[PDB]
């Protein structure tokens, strides 16, 4: 059923992209989301993958994200974006966690969500409110890199099944998967095998760091769907 | 049940209609003039192949070029599989009407009662006649994944009737699910006129080749064609 | 008094045959040439795992890639368990002859005296050799449940001999019973040439890996393998 795409060609430069809500500076639908602020998510022609327009996120400790509501009753979600980042993800000393993409239950907070990006310097996933992280600690501060300053196609597949799954592809290669309790470091989201329940109300993209890293991220050619996407 | 048939085209004599198949060529069932001296045709070729030295080559367009085989009676499902090499892409194409490489029909005599898999409106997808419904819906037209031109692709179409409340179609290309039907709202124009059991009566013939309703001429080669009432995979 | 062994493959060196296992690779018992440079092999791998960092990877096909462990003498019953990740499915598939992931054999030297669990004629099931009986019966071929490809599945096979009038096999995947033998008529040809005690002599070795008699090459990973004369858990 469900499909949405956005190449950002329809939006006006310097504005919040048409059709999207925001999570900017810790506020849902921050009235003050513009490029004159220090944190923002706006259409740019500064750079793009398709056409002349992409979205530009400037954020850090404070999140800069666009948000879209998802229809009720989804059994799976695929999120796909072309992504260009001022810093790399993965194989990174002294990272706590940082994320570019995810799904959340309630628009008003960042406290109940699945966050895809890196955890402990490996590509991976943080679930809140449990604050579990995957993969487990044997793998931290290593593994594959999403390089800075090049366009990457990122696909996250989330399937909700006896154990809910997540798979994250970059440039076609599978860099991260969750398929059992033991893929979480701290036991598996406090014992919940159906850990994506309640999570599929919103999809979000942009940048949020809990490692105090300020970043510019551009994204383009976003898709979400309840059927497989690929690059 | 247990139905399975395979053809690698290795046994057939070059430049002839593959042995064992009927045709639908130039709008005629078992056209008697199916060779390379016509404008549309379906013949064994040794110039390109996936398996061995031989494939079937289809040249057609607005006029269909197709090989056809009857099915057993009483099938609850059909799987069709082919290695496919196309002179033009399917999918993500401006201003397409619809074009198909593969499908099933009720009556060999015409092309007016069938399920056609290929693209509709420039998205990989499915056309049912005579309702003329198409899927997916308009919000996805002229976009989505491609079956690229000028490369070998494994194509699998799965059509499930049986005891399903809603009949299903799934099309895999090179392992990846590119197109699915599982509810009335997968159709653009309602839902094959309200028929949840939309594959009923359709499983009499299976056909392969090329037929465009966008007036696009094409060369398709196919090889390692398979048909079955149990799953096929690449 | 009982018997329990498990292997999570965490102790073993990557690219080596797992520590403490024998092999049956390329139709040779304890093939000295078992590494990732050969076309067929069974080795510890770190690119994929269920538990920890390590699992065992089999690459094989027509030629078997298996790890083998002796079982103690005197057993009345055997449970095998593996976490299994396959590059192709088992069950519900057109045109299969038979393929197996798991089993027990009477002697290490050969593949000719054994119980083979996997699929038979495209249903999940069991082949006994040398009788070549297969279960379930023909009624059920090319259908039924699947072990899907490209996911981790817990496979438990229970084989009960002992004082049963008719020896039994039960195969669970992810908790669901997918295959059962408890009478002569569960076999297509009436039960291993009239032998009600068809596991007799079979419990000398357990093996795990891949072997196809349908000419399908595959990559399998397995992990958390257990054997026991008592029930096993997922
Ligand atoms: Ca764009
Ligand atoms: Ca051929
Ligand atoms: Ca392990």
Residue numbers in the entry:
A (entry chain C): 3 to 162, 165 to 235
B (entry chain A), C (entry chain B): 2 to 235
Give excerpts from the publication:
Using a ‘module walking’ approach, we searched for other genes coding for these X-domains. This led to the identification of TERTU_2913, which lacks CBMs but contains predicted X122, X183 and X132 domains. Taken together, these sequence analyses suggested that TERTU_3803 and TERTU_2913 could have a role to play in cellulose metabolism, and furthermore that role is likely to be a redox one given the presence of cytochrome domains within their linear amino acid sequences.
In addition to our work on Ttpf08450-X173, we produced TtX122A and TtX122B, representing the X122 domains from TERTU_3803 and TERTU_2913, respectively. With the structure of TtX122A in hand, the structure of TtX122B could be solved to 2.2 Å via molecular replacement using a single protomer of TtX122A as an initial search model. Three molecules of TtX122B were present in the asymmetric unit, with chain B’s electron density most readily traced allowing modelling of residues 2 to 235 without breaks in the chain. Chains A and C had some areas that displayed more disorder, so there were breaks in the model between residues 190 and 192 in chain A and residues 162 and 165 in chain C. In addition to protein and water molecules, two magnesium ions were modelled into the electron density on each protomer in TtX122A based on coordination geometry and bond lengths [Fig. S4(a)]; these ions presumably bound from the crystallization medium. To check the oligomeric state of our TtX122 structures, PISA analysis was performed, which revealed that there were no significant molecular interfaces between protomers in the crystal for either structure, suggesting that the molecules would be expected to be monomeric in solution. Our subsequent structural analysis therefore focused on single protomers from each structure. The overall structures of TtX122A and TtX122B reveal that these domains adopt a β-jelly-roll fold [Figs. 4(a) and 4(b)]. Very similar results were observed for both TtX122A and TtX122B, in which there were only very small changes in antibody binding following X122 treatment in the case of some alginates (predominantly PAA and PAU) and wheat arabinoxylan, where twofold or threefold changes in antibody binding could be observed.
